[PDB]
Design a protein around this ligand. Structure first.
Ligand code: CL
Ligand code: CL
Ligand code: CL
Ligand code: PT
Ligand code: PT
Ligand code: PT
Ligand code: PT
Length: 127
């Protein structure tokens, strides 16, 4: 599924991301835009043996288990394929875990580089 920004915003809001750990909804929508272009099926297979999965490009070393990544921690306790679902619940739940495990949103390189310090509210404006 490729979400619209407003539809994603509403779905993220239903799962409690607005203001989750002090990060406004627009931050999360902006992170998704630049990580995956709102595509739930996005994958980026890295040279280090890991792969980034789904709408938030969550990595298989620390966060989800794809079975094939060295050093797997599976801190989200999920198979990475769950992060490729049409519904975003598993991605959102793991994103919240990533923050809960001592990370800011700077854990997402696209967030740091493309959303941090910007007008993130543009991404929910008009929704
Ligand atoms: Cl959730
Ligand atoms: Cl929930
Ligand atoms: Cl693995
Ligand atoms: Pt939902
Ligand atoms: Pt929901
Ligand atoms: Pt939820
Ligand atoms: Pt739900």
């Amino acid at each position: 599924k490729v979400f619209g920004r407003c539809e994603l915003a509403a779905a993220m809001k239903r799962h409690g991301l607005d203001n989750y750990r002090g990060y406004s909804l627009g931050n999360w929508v902006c992170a998704a835009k630049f990580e995956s272009n709102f595509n739930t099926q996005a994958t980026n297979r890295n040279t280090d043996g890991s792969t980034d999965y789904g709408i938030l490009q969550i990595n298989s070393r620390w966060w989800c288990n794809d079975g094939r990544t060295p050093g797997s921690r599976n801190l989200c306790n999920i198979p990475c394929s769950a992060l490729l679902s049409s519904d975003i619940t598993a991605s959102v739940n793991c994103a919240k875990k990533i923050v809960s495990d001592g990370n800011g949103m700077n854990a997402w390189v696209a967030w740091r580089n493309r959303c941090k310090g910007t007008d993130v509210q543009a991404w929910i404006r008009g929704c």
